[PDB]
Design a protein around this nucleic acid. Structure first.
Ligand SMILES: [Mg+2]
Ligand SMILES: [Mg+2]
Ligand SMILES: [Mg+2]
Ligand SMILES: [Mg+2]
Ligand SMILES: [Mg+2]
Ligand SMILES: [Mg+2]
Ligand SMILES: [Mg+2]
Ligand SMILES: [Mg+2]
Ligand SMILES: [Mg+2]
Ligand SMILES: [Mg+2]
Ligand SMILES: [Mg+2]
Ligand SMILES: [Mg+2]
Ligand SMILES: [Mg+2]
Ligand SMILES: [Mg+2]
Ligand SMILES: [Mg+2]
Ligand SMILES: [Mg+2]
Ligand SMILES: [Mg+2]
Ligand SMILES: [Mg+2]
Ligand SMILES: [Mg+2]
Ligand SMILES: [Mg+2]
Ligand SMILES: [Mg+2]
Ligand SMILES: [Mg+2]
Ligand SMILES: [Mg+2]
Ligand SMILES: [Mg+2]
Ligand SMILES: [Mg+2]
Ligand SMILES: [Mg+2]
Ligand SMILES: [Mg+2]
Ligand SMILES: [Mg+2]
Ligand code: NA
Ligand code: NA
Lengths: 54, 72, 266, 118, 152
RNA sequence: AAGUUUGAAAAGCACUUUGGAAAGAGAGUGAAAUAGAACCUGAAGUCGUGACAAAGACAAUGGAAGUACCUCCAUUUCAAC
RNA sequence: UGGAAAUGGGGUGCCCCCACCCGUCUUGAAACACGGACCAAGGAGUCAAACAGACGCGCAAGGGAGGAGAUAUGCCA
RNA sequence: GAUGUGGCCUGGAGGUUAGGACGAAGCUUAUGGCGUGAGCCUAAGAUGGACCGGCCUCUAGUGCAGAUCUUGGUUGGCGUAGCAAAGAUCUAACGGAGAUAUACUCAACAUGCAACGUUGGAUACUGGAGCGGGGAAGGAUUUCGUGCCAACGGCACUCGUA
RNA sequence: AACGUGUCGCGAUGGAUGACUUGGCUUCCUAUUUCGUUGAAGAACGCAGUAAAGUGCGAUAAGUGGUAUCAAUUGCAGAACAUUC
């Protein structure tokens, strides 16, 4: 049976999942802490380079 | 966690709670919201009154910031 | 995403006395006509291949994290809980253990070891040292060769010092400004053995606040109120006030004898 | 250092000839350590060693070959007989032997000067 | 471990064996088993008479739909044959065992066979061609033989 | 398809003898050859051999309760106990 | 105090009695209904997203992010 | 068909507590003991040779008798069906380990059979639209000499396009 | 009797299991980082005292020159600046 549930609209009918025949269309954030570290390091290096300017 | 699911309890039952007669087939009633007026009409009418039709005027380019108005 | 599916396999259909599984095309090799594309076939694709967008990480409420840290710190000050967790504290002078702050001026591991022997943490250090061994199972081939127990944790007020303590095997170092629950309750069990310096011990009150004064560091945080004012319910149950209102004890029937009782009226 | 056991082992067993020379080092005697203040040196042909581990423990002889392809050295006095009566040498890993007298050349003396701990 | 059984007295026994003989295992099984309890000289006479076709080898286990003969009556059977390739192989094995006994310093006229065992060895593969373009196995089945004898 | 994964080290079986040879019987190396060369461990299934149990034709297997014979198994007892 | 006795297990045979071949679809199988020569290794309710209910935990007329930054921090995803 | 279980079992992680060259894992069983049961534990190995058990949490590619299931191996049928188109070989001497190969008795037969290459004789077949002598397509050392007989020439070989 | 059946000790055939792992898969980072008519990628044929495949190389052919190092390479030949030819 189905019963009393919300009518679903989940919007996943395109080839988004990478499989044996599809490249997929996805974006993950597994590099977030590394990129945060890189940005802070770049800011510190740039400040050292342009010292004493703000 | 996989160790709390019904599959672990059903190992050895050969049918996993879907019956010998009806069985577990692919799509026995169509996919998604199909048949809302034909063979799912009772469900749609008793649980979701007002799903079908049109009502009211249209507002083409809605901007919510000019409509912001909270109350206390 | 391509593993097990890099073949041009097709089913032979019925009419040949073989199963309907897809089979490798071609000829001239031992793999010609063999099964393919199936979780039950040799060289086939696994069932439900694993993906990288599984939920690996978790969110936790900030207040719940702070509550857990507070509970671990409170448990670390009960000597019976520390022994139950498994640390060897039999010659320790006092729990919580607080020492002078001059240890930050050490420069030699020999001096650090002398201090540990004086403070009597050497028993736990020796326990950790003697527990070292090679890991059991597959983990020894995956850069997890050795395992050992957890020893005492020494808390410092800042990042200075620690030069003479870094190489001592079986001793952990912590900073009072960033206390870690994974180190305060290893394996999910409370009761870590902690050695405090005077400066960090004094900073604790300002860091964590009291029941009535908010923390200076954690904005708008106070210690949770207890559910019970006194947690000794046995004393309450045996107090005179309760015994005054308890129901009286009555005399019961005598215990049945060894002989069987009769049941035949006629 | 190297947190990968797989990478550490690959570098050891695929090392070139000049890297295997350093890996096949032996400690010096107490008398030689006092004289040069050096704990260990790579083994060289025409050196004097004494065996400290294994069945040939206590034997003495002169190094005749550093094979470097089988990770062994050959000593003249360490040998055994075959079935037909001939004599063959037995290889010993350099970390089991101890050097008792160094073959000194001009380049060798410069190396000892570099590694002096004083 | 070499032999499945051990002689009662080792100093008065001789042994012999052969591996991967390249004779039919079923034929060699019947040929070797018939001499299990016989004296050495009596066993050698029997093999000579089989080659002359005056006595036969009884086939007791692997005998499905073979011919009947009158020479099988002395063994209490009705089916027997004269496998010459197995016989000459067993003749050589007895000579080797006899040579071992003489080297020890025993009398070959006083020796009795006490142990005979024949086992299947690894097979060799050829092919044959059938109707409708089919290819079907065409295999060979060699055998292992071991024995020892003791002096009476 | 296919780990050449013997052994710490080839020390990879000199020599006697039977055989055309393959090999067998001795001897020897090695802590082990039950580690003898694509040689660590060496399962299941199937087969050979020795000893024993018997057994008609009820296809065989199976249950329940006894008995005959065996038992490299366990526990208990061995003195006014 | 023994090559001991006794009581339980274990093995093989025998006697009297009892006893249709497993899995499956089916109203109905033992069936003249289908799949079934033997063994080893492999083999099938999973991951993600939206919603709801029951149960556990924190706070409460408020609850909570996310993205990002800052410095302990330059061992530490 | 639903639900419960300080219910059993498998690979890995955070803790804690132990074991091992006086022998870990794995493997074998007329080795008993325990549990209603999934299973757990001990004994023996005249097996093996270097790792690994219990308990509390966490985690998952986590339990097989059958899918005309997949891959590898084995197996009764079975020494069975058969190895029947193209007429065919016989003899002596050389060669070869391939023989005239024996315990007693004994003259020889009735106790070493069967099979092979070369040469000389004999007897046959192909019958010039030939199992004659040369080429194209295709093949690519199959050509020649010496040696050798593990596998291959569906029987055999001392022979061979091996 | 014989064939056949059953249990135990030993032995064959067979290659599972355990332990091992210079391989795979997945996730991050660094930078003076992106071929060719000045003939590339790919294809062919050759080269060692002994050399089939593979690896390296091109008639200067398992390689010439330079810097560093510091005594081998090895199945067997062969050769023999150490001040580093
Ligand atoms: Mg319904
Ligand atoms: Mg259900
Ligand atoms: Mg249905
Ligand atoms: Mg695969
Ligand atoms: Mg017939
Ligand atoms: Mg045919
Ligand atoms: Mg072994
Ligand atoms: Mg083996
Ligand atoms: Mg077996
Ligand atoms: Mg029945
Ligand atoms: Mg019907
Ligand atoms: Mg049925
Ligand atoms: Mg009927
Ligand atoms: Mg059907
Ligand atoms: Mg808000
Ligand atoms: Mg796994
Ligand atoms: Mg049994
Ligand atoms: Mg699975
Ligand atoms: Mg299975
Ligand atoms: Mg026939
Ligand atoms: Mg015929
Ligand atoms: Mg025919
Ligand atoms: Mg004909
Ligand atoms: Mg003859
Ligand atoms: Mg002739
Ligand atoms: Mg012609
Ligand atoms: Mg043939
Ligand atoms: Mg030129
Ligand atoms: Na569904
Ligand atoms: Na003519």
């Amino acid at each position: 049976p189905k019963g009393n549930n919300a009518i679903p609209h989940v919007h996943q009918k395109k080839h988004w999942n990478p499989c044996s025949s599809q490249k997929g269309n996805v974006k993950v954030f597994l590099n977030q802490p590394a990129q945060k570290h890189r940005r802070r390091r770049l800011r510190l290096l740039k400040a050292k380079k342009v010292f004493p300017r703000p | 966690p996989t160790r709390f699911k019904k599959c672990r309890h059903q190992r050895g039952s050969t049918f996993c709670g879907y019956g010998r007669v009806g069985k577990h087939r692919k799509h026995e009633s169509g996919r998604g919201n199909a048949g809302g007026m034909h063979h799912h009409r009772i469900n749609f009418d008793k649980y979701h009154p007002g799903y079908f039709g049109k009502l009211g005027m249209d507002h083409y380019h809605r901007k919510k910031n000019p409509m912001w108005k909270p109350t206390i | 995403r391509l593993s097990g599916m890099n073949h041009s396999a097709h089913s032979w259909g019925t009419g040949r006395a073989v199963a309907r599984i897809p089979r490798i095309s071609g000829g001239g090799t031992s793999t010609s006509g063999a099964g393919a594309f199936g979780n039950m076939c040799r060289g086939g694709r696994m069932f439900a291949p694993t993906k990288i967008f599984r939920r690996w990480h978790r969110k936790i409420n900030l207040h719940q994290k702070r509550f857990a840290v507070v509970s671990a710190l409170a448990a670390s000050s009960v000597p019976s809980l520390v022994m139950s967790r498994g640390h060897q504290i039999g010659n320790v002078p006092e729990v919580p253990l607080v020492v002078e702050d001059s240890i930050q001026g050490y420069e030699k591991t020999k001096e650090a070891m002398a201090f540990l022997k004086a403070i009597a943490a050497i028993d736990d250090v020796n326990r950790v040292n003697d527990s070292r061994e090679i890991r059991a199972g597959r983990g020894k081939m995956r850069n997890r060769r050795y395992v050992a127990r957890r020893g005492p944790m020494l808390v410092m007020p800042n990042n200075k010092g620690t030069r003479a303590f870094r190489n001592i095997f079986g001793l952990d170092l912590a900073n009072v400004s960033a206390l870690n629950l994974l180190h305060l309750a290893p394996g999910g069990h409370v009761g870590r053995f902690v050695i405090w310096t005077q400066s960090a011990f004094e900073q604790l009150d300002k860091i964590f606040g009291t029941f009535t004064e908010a923390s200076a560091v954690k904005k708008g945080f106070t210690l949770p109120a207890p559910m019970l004012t006194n947690t000794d319910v046995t004393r309450i149950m045996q107090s005179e006030e309760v015994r005054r209102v308890l129901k009286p004890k009555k005399l019961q029937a005598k215990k049945a004898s060894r002989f069987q009782t009769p049941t035949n009226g006629m | 250092k190297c947190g990968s056991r797989r990478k550490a082992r690959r570098a050891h067993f695929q090392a070139p000839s000049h890297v295997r020379r350093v890996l096949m080092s032996a400690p010096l005697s107490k008398e030689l350590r006092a004289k040069y203040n050096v704990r260990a040196m790579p083994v060289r042909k025409d050196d004097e060693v004494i065996v400290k581990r294994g069945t040939f423990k206590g034997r003495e002889g002169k190094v005749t070959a550093c094979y470097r392809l089988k990770w062994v050295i050959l000593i003249d006095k360490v040998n055994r007989e075959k079935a037909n009566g001939s004599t063959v040498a037995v290889g010993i890993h350099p970390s089991n032997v101890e050097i008792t007298k160094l073959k000194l050349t001009h380049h060798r003396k410069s190396i000892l000067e570099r590694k002096d701990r004083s | 471990t070499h032999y499945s059984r051990k002689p009662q007295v080792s100093s008065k026994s001789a042994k012999a064996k052969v591996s991967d003989l390249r004779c039919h295992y079923k034929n060699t099984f019947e040929t070797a088993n018939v001499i299990n309890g016989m004296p050495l000289r009596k066993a050698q006479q029997l093999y000579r008479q089989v080659l002359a076709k005056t006595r036969c080898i009884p086939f007791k286990r692997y005998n499905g739909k073979i011919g009947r003969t009158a020479q099988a009556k002395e063994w209490g059977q009705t089916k027997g044959r004269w496998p010459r390739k197995s016989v000459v192989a067993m003749m050589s094995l007895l000579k080797n065992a006899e040579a071992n006994a003489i080297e020890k310093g025993l009398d070959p006229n006083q020796m009795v066979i006490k142990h005979v065992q024949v086992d299947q060895a690894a097979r060799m593969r050829r092919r044959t061609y059938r109707a409708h373009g089919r290819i079907t196995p065409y295999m060979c089945s060699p055998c292992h033989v071991q024995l020892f004898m003791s002096e009476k």
